[PDB]
Paper text:
Mammalian DNA methylation is established by de novo DNA methyltransferases [name] and DNMT3B4, and subsequently subjected to maintenance by DNA methyltransferase DNMT1 in a replication-dependent manner. [name]-mediated DNA methylation is further regulated by DNMT3-like protein ([name]) during gametogenesis and embryogenesis. Among these, mutation of [name] has been identified in ~25% acute myeloid leukemia (AML) patients, which gives rise to aberrant DNA methylation patterns and increased cell proliferation, and correlates with poor clinical outcome. To gain further insights into the context-dependent DNA methylation by [name] and the mutational effect of [name], we determined the crystal structure of wild-type [name] (DNMT3AWT)–[name] tetramer in complex with a [name] motif-containing DNA, as well as [name]-mutated [name] (DNMT3AR882H)–[name] tetramer in complex with [name]- and CGT-containing DNAs.
To understand how the [name] mutation of [name] affects its structure and function, we determined the crystal structure of the complex between the DNMT3AR882H–[name] tetramer and [name] DNA (DNMT3AR882H–[name]), containing the same sequence as that for the DNMT3AWT–[name] complex, and SAH at 2.5 Å resolution. Structural alignment of the entire DNMT3AR882H-[name] complex with the DNMT3AWT–[name] complex gives an RMSD of 0.29 Å over 875 aligned Cα atoms, suggesting that the [name] mutation does not alter the structural integrity of the [name]–[name] tetramer. The most notable structural difference between the DNMT3AWT–[name] and DNMT3AR882H–[name] complexes lies in the DNA conformation: In comparison with the DNMT3AWT–[name] complex, the central segment of the DNMT3AR882H-bound DNA molecule bends away by ~2 Å from the RD interface in the DNMT3AR882H–[name] complex. The protein–DNA contact at the RD interface of DNMT3AR882H in the [name] DNA complex is mainly mediated by residues S881, H882, and L883, which form hydrogen bonds and/or van der Waals contacts with the DNA backbone. The fact that the DNMT3AR882H–[name] complex was crystalized under acidic condition (pH 4.2) likely contributed to the H882-mediated hydrogen-bonding interaction. In addition, the side chain of R887 is poised for electrostatic interaction with the backbone phosphate of A15/A10′. Together, these interactions lead to a buried surface area of 238 Å2 in this region, lower than that for the DNMT3AWT–[name] complex, suggesting that the [name] mutation leads to reduced protein–DNA contact at the RD interface. The TRD loop in the DNMT3AR882H–[name] complex adopts a similar conformation to that in the DNMT3AWT–[name] complex, with residue N838 engaging a base-specific hydrogen-bonding interaction with G6, and R836 forming hydrogen bonds with the +2 (T8) and +3 (G9′) flanking bases. Furthermore, as with the DNMT3AWT–[name] complex, the hydrogen bond between the side chain of R882 and the backbone carbonyl of S837 is also abrogated in the DNMT3AR882H–[name] complex.
Author numbering:
A (entry chain A), C (entry chain D): 628 to 912
B (entry chain B): 178 to 213, 217 to 313, 317 to 354, 358 to 380
D (entry chain C): 185 to 208, 215 to 313, 318 to 354, 361 to 378
DNA sequence: CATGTGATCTAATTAGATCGCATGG
DNA sequence: CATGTGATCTAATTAGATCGCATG
């Protein structure tokens, strides 16, 4: 019979602030949201959609141990480092130790910096996400530096898109079975605007690239409107990813810039499933 | 923890070395005796945390990048990340009061970007070591106080640039530069000799 | 007593269906809303934003007296013909009698076709809009063909932008003063997203062209964001025009394609002021 | 028998020289230019039984675009119509001297709700007419291709009517003779 | 026997400057 | 005399087709 506290979160590679979006969707009170992000479009979405709650600190490599101690303590450390040098979709990927790959170790470093000293049993939770389609030795090393094996959660069972992602962390019930809640839209048709017909029940994985919205090797169009073929609109991608509609409609972004943000982000119901047991550890309503 | 202990209360140093066996240097200064205390690890890619702990406690963790040559089956930053990983595995529990030292040595193998990483993951900038009678140079990161208070002949990175240049061209480690960095630790551990 | 009936509307050059939007916001029941429009983006907006209520009939020159007879009768005929060959902002304007200017006479023709016979006293209302910045002779001829003088209503009095427009028609009280409702956003600051500062109370007239977003002849940016000068975003234009936010976030349209639709449209509060007295003539929710 | 004199309003063109050659305080009213003519003007000019308007020939002294004449024609044609209770006949005549182009021709047929009958003469030029009179649409005439007249019009531009009287004649059966 | 939090090239936009002058304020 | 339901021109920047092969 003790009263829990609002959560303090350090979010690295914050993107379009999916983490804060879900924490609010769960009723978890948030005392501090410190985000390291470098993309100005990303930052603008977070700043606007969360009304200046997020505190931005810039490049993850500008964040020292001294900063962690001043800004902390933290109860939650989350992030997913860039995968453009890890994913096997890229034939020119520079790997875990080069290019953007090595930005993973900045997560490892700040996580070490943010951990409670042994003997301190205060609640501390962390989550790290990346792609399944990476080299076997890069998944080996990531698990070696995090000292955990990951959980494979495919967004297909709670959304309208395939998205097989790895999840390292210590959140409670991380491997419990996923369950399609009634606020998930499991089929593409339920994500489309009025007057449009889905040609597929579920779309393949949506990257930052336009060829990922067309289906298969034959590049099939996903939707019929007026008996004419068409690709997904931005608002349909947002629903496929679980975001509120028009979430990314900021900053005069083109539809490709919006897809750039969405294609790097997390599937919202997947995270919501992962963050859900946190509301038993922190203040709510 | 920059304090010393009386000569009679000093135990033999236990040393974990990675990517390099430094047994010869430390016995040559009498840190080890010639009986059959130092663990050198093969391939750190699969050494977990329990392994470092089961290898007994360590008072010093040493890591080095291989010198200018064609041994790099791995990228030059791999050795530094791996060193930092196993280094945290080998730190003692916050209760322990004994002296704990670490050291990472670079032989001009890391370029400007990899060096900024090194200084960021070890929270200190390296110290350059010049070899005059100029033939070589090393950069060193360590918590050893006398390597941060004594100052050898400061040389600019553009000068190391050029020798880095001449070291590429002519292509073992310069132990003469390495040996002096262990000098101020015999004031902390047990001495031995022939 | 005799109960009032839902309104039946012929909407020429419907654009993004402002007319149906304002009628719905007034509570006026709409039995049918037949719209003449050719631009695919415009039709897509109206189709999506009004769930297929709109009856699209294509080019205004394809609409015959026979069609008016079959599809009618109509209680309300509205439209505003293209102005690119009328407004003095185009040095190459081809005038009222050529280019797109001659599409005005199509409004004049379908209006005649839809008017009740003399002796028929059924309620019939119509409204024609165009820009103030046209030629003396062209404005003279429009009033000759519609047999009425226009009323000048500037949107600056009920919104955050200058938009001086002429309005020909027979709606009750077209010359009554304009009052600001509390739903009107009078200053630019009230239309901006969080974190952004307005440099002007009111902005100049917004056309389809980007130079109309920057102010003065010196092309001043209208907004500050973290001390950086910026132009208005799409959602901010929508608020400046009085539309729902993200109204035009349809069909993967770029900000310029969204600005093409908005810069040709009506100021929503102005139309609401013009349509409000229709509530006493037709059925309402 | 009881056939009162004709009442003709003519626009852009005074046809009196072939109006009394046809033999019909003048009944014919002629408007200077129509740009400021309104309904009360046409109304107080008394009832009309035929309203006439035409395009100038290919040539100068025109300061107006070719479709200006039509729209203005159409405008005052409606000004002159009588109420449905009025039993008297009513005819209207628009007629082009090959100045309208293909885009301007479709506007003509769409605003007048019928397509033109063409009138040729070779021995000069050719002419198209829109009108409700059942003696120019229904009376069978020499058929000329649209590109025949296209080529004759190019030959007319290179180069620089009794058929305008031949079309006015058949109204004599409804009005007074000579 | 597919598959992909991508990238490299092309043709395809836009970003922005610039032009325009009749008009009624 | 400041203004404008637009249009042209052309760098500098994006859109979209094809390209990968390790891995699950
Ligand atoms: N040096 C750096 N410091 C901080 N963030 C960086 C960075 N380099 C890349 N990033 C950001 O890391 C992100 C990884 S993609 C992950 C975004 C997040 N999962 C979401 O839901 O939106 C990208 O947004 C990229 O802009
Ligand atoms: N031939 C034609 N037939 C019907 N509509 C046409 C047309 N030519 C152009 N248009 C349309 O006429 C419109 C004039 S702009 C007026 C838009 C409307 N008032 C709104 O509030 O949105 C444009 O949308 C243009 O696409």
């Amino acid at each position: 019979a003790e009263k829990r506290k609002p959560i303090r979160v350090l979010s690295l590679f914050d993107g379009i602030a999916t983490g804060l979006l879900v924490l609010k969707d769960l009723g978890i009170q948030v005392d501090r949201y410190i985000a390291s992000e470098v993309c100005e479009d990303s930052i603008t979405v977070g700043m606007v959609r969360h009304q200046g709650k997020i505190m931005y600190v810039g490049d993850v490599r500008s964040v020292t141990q001294k900063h962690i101690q001043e800004w902390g303590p933290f109860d939650l450390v989350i992030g997913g480092s860039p995968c453009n040098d890890l994913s096997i979709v890229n034939p020119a990927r520079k790997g875990l130790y080069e290019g953007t790959g090595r930005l993973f170790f900045e997560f490892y470093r700040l996580l070490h910096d943010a951990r409670p000293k042994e003997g301190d049993d205060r609640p501390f939770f962390w989550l790290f996400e990346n792609v399944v389609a990476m080299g076997v030795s890069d998944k080996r090393d990531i698990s070696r530096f995090l000292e955990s094996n990951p959980v494979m959660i495919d967004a297909k069972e709670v959304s309208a898109a395939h998205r097989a992602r790895y999840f390292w962390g210590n959140l409670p019930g991380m491997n419990r079975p996923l369950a399609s809640t009634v606020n998930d839209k499991l089929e593409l048709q339920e994500c489309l605007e009025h007057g449009r017909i889905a040609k597929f029940s579920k779309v393949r994985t949506i990257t930052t690239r336009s060829n990922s919205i067309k289906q298969g090797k034959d590049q099939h169009f996903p939707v019929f409107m007026n008996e004419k073929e068409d690709i997904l609109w931005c608002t349909e991608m947002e629903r496929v990813f679980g975001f509120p509609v028009h979430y990314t409609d900021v900053s005069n972004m083109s539809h490709l810039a919006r897809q750039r943000l969405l294609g790097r982000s997390w599937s919202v119901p997947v995270i919501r499933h992962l963050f859900a047991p946190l509301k038993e550890y922190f203040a709510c309503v | 923890m920059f304090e010393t202990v009386p000569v009679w209360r000093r135990q033999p140093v236990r040393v974990l070395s990675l990517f390099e066996d430094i047994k010869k240097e430390l016995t040559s200064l009498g840190f080890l005796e010639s009986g059959s205390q130092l663990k050198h690890v093969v391939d750190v890619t699969d050494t977990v945390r329990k392994d470092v702990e089961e290898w007994g406690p360590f008072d010093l963790v040493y890591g080095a990048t291989p010198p200018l040559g064609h041994t790099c089956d791995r990228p030059p930053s791999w050795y530094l990340f791996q060193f930092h990983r196993l280094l945290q595995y080998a730190r003692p529990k916050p209760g322990s009061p004994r002296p704990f030292f670490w050291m990472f040595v670079d032989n001009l193998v890391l370029n400007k970007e990899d060096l900024d990483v090194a200084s960021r993951f070890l929270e200190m900038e390296p110290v350059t070591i010049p070899d005059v009678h100029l033939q070589n140079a090393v950069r060193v990161w360590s918590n050893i106080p006398a390597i941060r208070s004594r100052h050898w002949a400061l040389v600019s990175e553009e000068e190391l640039s050029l020798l880095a240049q001449n070291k590429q061209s002519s292509k073992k480690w310069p132990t003469k530069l390495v040996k002096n960095c262990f000098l101020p630790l015999r004031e902390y551990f047990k001495y031995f000799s022939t």
